[PDB]
Amino acid sequence: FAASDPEYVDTLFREQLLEVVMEGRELRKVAREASNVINANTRVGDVPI
Amino acid sequence: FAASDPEYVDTLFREQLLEVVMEGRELRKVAREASNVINANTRVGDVPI
Ligand SMILES: [Mg+2]
Ligand SMILES: [Mg+2]
Numbered sequence: 001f002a003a004s005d006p007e008y009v010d011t012l013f014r015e016q017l018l019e020v021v022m023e024g025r026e027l028r029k030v031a032r033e034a035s036n037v038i039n040a041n042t043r044v045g046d047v048p049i
Numbered sequence: 050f051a052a053s054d055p056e057y058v059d060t061l062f063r064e065q066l067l068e069v070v071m072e073g074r075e076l077r078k079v080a081r082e083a084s085n086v087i088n089a090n091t092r093v094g095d096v097p098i
Contacts, residue, residue, distance in 0.1 A: 010095070011095075011097055012097055
């Protein structure tokens with residue numbers, strides 16, 4: 001009837017797609033706080049104890 | 050023979066190569082003048098009528 005969005009839902013405009021994508025399951029990021037972090041200069045090395 | 054150009058055609062001189070490359074078949078290109086060009090934001094779309 002008249003002109004309503006249920007008729008022209010793909011004709012006069014598009015349904016919004018939100019610019020934000022909502023996350024999947026996110027696993028808990030802790031390691032950087034939960035341990036001492038060493039920025040190594042080498043892939044292999046040893047720490048003195 | 051004595052000294053003839055078909056003997057020394059690749060030894061005393063080199064055959065002429067004409068500097069103009071001759072064009073092949075050129076098709077008639079008109080669509081851009083002969084229609085309305087829509088620069089689209091998507092591959093698949095719709096136009097309202
Ligand atoms: Mg070691
Ligand atoms: Mg469509």
